[PDB]
Scaffold this active site. Structure first.
Site, PDB file in Angstrom:
ATOM      1  N   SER D 142       0.866  -1.184   0.000  1.00 49.39           N
ATOM      2  CA  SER D 142       0.000   0.000   0.000  1.00 49.39           C
ATOM      3  C   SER D 142       0.899   1.230   0.000  1.00 49.39           C
ATOM      4  CB  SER D 142      -0.900   0.027   1.244  1.00 49.39           C
ATOM      5  OG  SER D 142      -1.564   1.271   1.367  1.00 49.39           O
ATOM      6  N   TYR D 155      -1.877   0.831  10.959  1.00 51.07           N
ATOM      7  CA  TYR D 155      -1.924   0.415   9.559  1.00 51.07           C
ATOM      8  C   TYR D 155      -0.629   0.748   8.841  1.00 51.07           C
ATOM      9  CZ  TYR D 155      -3.700  -0.337   4.805  1.00 51.07           C
ATOM     10  OH  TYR D 155      -3.905  -0.801   3.527  1.00 51.07           O
TER      11      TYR D 155
END
Lengths: 268, 268, 268, 268
Positions: D142, D155
């Site tokens: 990501s 995250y």
């Protein structure tokens, strides 16, 4: 007085960040040889630091002038411990589409000769002294060596090329000379360009560009360099790259900072 | 055939990786214009591919030659979808200490004019056509754009500079033109150096260099470029950097690969 | 004395690098609170420094223990200027293949709870005090936050995760709290692993690992942390990552250092 | 049909990007084993791809379920060529200051167990098959594995940890298994979070966040994965990291893109 007894050579040290570095290094007990183009500004600098600074007029693009500076430093102080290749020129953030076709070849040489070749010549000239002292090189980079929009293709390419110099020279000069980079950014300073050629207001700078929310004075950009010049502090560091630009690379999508209102949120 | 109806322009495409890229793109259904200094090797590829490849003899350092390649590509095929500036020159991995003082200036120019300025001119030449077709640029970088010991200071600095071009040009040409970089590495190409300048064989040192444990054929490096040229596959990619060097950046300390004994330990 | 009147809180500060950091900060004029699992080694440092260091016995994985360290630091000294979350656990450089299936879950937790969650809790505990003093965080990372072969998957993943914390926390705590990372590497520390889990000596392989060509004493790694703790020196730095590992990321292919023969080639 | 004869295992392949990957891989001639939590969604997927897909219900956090998936894949297709550990959970971009003290310990386990441990378990389980086939792993990363503000500390730390997995596993599994990362971003997709816990509108996304100026559909994120799974195309690639997020890392300070008005400026 972290640098008592140390000797530095700084290119482009007559004005700007170069001068702030010269002033900082002298205040730390170091002695400084300065290579720059302005004779009058160099002499003014010499007398401001009586005995701790020597000024040599010359062109950073010339290996012979770089050699002169190293010889002059050797003659005045007896050694070179730290080299700071720092002299650089900007491109005005001139985009590729805005670079005139009749101007690109000259502009390329002007920016690359100062920004990259002048760094190469500085190391080359000071190399015997640095091996002898087991010294260090600390290249001035820029945010433009890491992210876009700090200059046009030319400037951005030059500052990326000096990251390559940090890496290759840290390898090549090991184990005798350490080689590191400071990458300053968001400074309050006027960046000059080349003869061939010729950008963000304060409001956008501190809301969108700089997480730290302020434009630091030049003196505040001098400590990272002092760190790399301090033998007792930086010995494990070679090939290091210190981003020193207010947090440009960790800025957010919508705002630069995410915690402006922490004092009130944590009700400290 | 992933590139049917597409037009590529490749600089340095008459030998080495460039030639493998011409072959691959033609085989993918693309029409290809090639800028190269070698009329002989250009004629050779023109007879191999027929009306699917046009060659233009020229110098990558020259803007007028790059423009001439772009116009010749337009005249033959109607558009430019992909630009692969690829043409490069090595520095015989010559250390700074070993760079002669009387040759270092000309050596700087030779390698930077082709490796960096030739890339800039390629994009400058093709910009109107690339913006018109909303196409893409894919710069050939190198492991020397990322890690030391893949060339001397000059070459390593140049390849680090093209990393700067990937980033700045991705910003500048967005949203219309995507700009990405492939960084190939474990090749057995015999890349030439400059005439202004007079390394262990890769096979001899493979186990200190390549985790993949093998030397890929030139054709094995062409797929990354096809990926970036294919709109339906690489659309979200701009400013991307693909290290494509056999894993040089993830090599271990004692040996490159860490799992030589995996088939025995798992009983394959 | 660069840190007169300053207060630091260091986790894992009773042995190894942590202890060297306590010694250095106290010698720089700072007052220091220490969170460590070792009551014995904490008592020892308390008698060495007197009223300049307070020790709190606790578990870095525990938020209440981290909070207890922060409150104890506040009660003793009035503020927290610098947080150094430093406490770490190794994985014996255990490869994935060699991670037992019946132990891999607990091993994951042990190493991630201290290496990552303990860092998060440290900052969480100290946030009000750090925002109040407009101070800074300096995370101890590692060469394993950047390159392979410095630990197994578990440790390498954790140290890569603290790189994530440097970046995210620099964004989140700006403009008030600067967050930076030091990534130390060539140390002779004997760092322990988890109880849920049963590598060549650095000296034996030095020439394949360290360009600097030597193993620095623990005290040689403390200067980077002092730099980041000194407001007048590291003000423009947030989200910075200092590779401080002897040059592991710029090592050559055949040998780490490329200039062993420089003194002979230059005639020093 | 780049993947005719190849077999892939994809975690989290029942919906989102996982499903787009499954659909793409099947369209390319590949056969796909899917590990996901929803039995009904897996069976619907199986019948959509009659014979080219096998669905296995299970938890990505469980090595036993990961093993089941690998065994099931082996039984249906006879081999595993490509592993795509892809299953991930979000943190809602919950800042450190907004993470409840009574919730952080659970939240950490929930996100790290899926995002990092589930990737580790997938490789572990598929390892014998991948060594046997000389296959490859392609981890879904990501933008949050590279820059801040794509998630909160949790995250962002997990996605940085998987970059560490790419590097360490590329080293550890060499020379038999290649290991690479795709880092997608700016996708049109709903990201789920954990039970313990619980961000940019379109206008700000395309002006400030995404240089490409558009939010691509999920199918457009599938080509990079197909590239890494194509043995003929990606052999030199191990430890590669492809940023695949619309240009987030090369975005400008004031606007994402710098060349919106090139068509009119070049008057194409």
């Amino acid at each position: 007085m972290k640098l008592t007894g140390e000797v530095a050579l700084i290119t482009g040290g007559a004005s700007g960040l170069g001068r702030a570095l010269v002033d900082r290094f002298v205040a730390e007990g170091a002695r400084v040889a300065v290579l720059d183009k302005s004779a009058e500004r160099l002499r003014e600098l010499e007398v401001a630091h009586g005995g701790n600074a020597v000024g040599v007029v010359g062109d950073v693009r010339s290996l012979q002038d770089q050699k002169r500076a190293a010889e002059r430093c050797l003659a005045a102080f007896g050694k070179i411990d730290t080299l700071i290749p720092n002299a650089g020129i900007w491109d005005y953030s001139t985009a590729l589409a805005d670079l005139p076709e009749d101007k690109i070849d000259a502009a390329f040489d002007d920016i690359f000769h100062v920004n990259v070749k002048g760094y190469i010549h500085a190391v080359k000239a000071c190399l015997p002294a640095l091996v002898s002292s087991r010294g260090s090189v600390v290249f001035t980079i820029s945010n433009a060596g890491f992210y876009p929009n700090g200059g046009g293709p030319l400037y951005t390419a030059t500052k990326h090329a000096v990251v390559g110099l940090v890496r290759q020279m840290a390898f090549e000069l090991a184990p005798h000379v350490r080689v590191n980079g400071v990458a300053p950014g968001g400074m309050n300073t006027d960046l000059r360009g080349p003869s061939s050629l010729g950008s963000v207001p304060l409001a956008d700078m501190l809301k969108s560009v700089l997480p730290i929310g302020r434009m630091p004075a030049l003196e505040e950009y001098t400590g990272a360099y002092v760190f790399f010049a301090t033998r007792g502090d930086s010995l494990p560091a070679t090939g290091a790259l210190l981003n020193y630009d207010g947090g440009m690379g960790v800025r957010g999508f919508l705002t630069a900072a995410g915690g402006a209102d922490l004092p009130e949120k944590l009700n400290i």
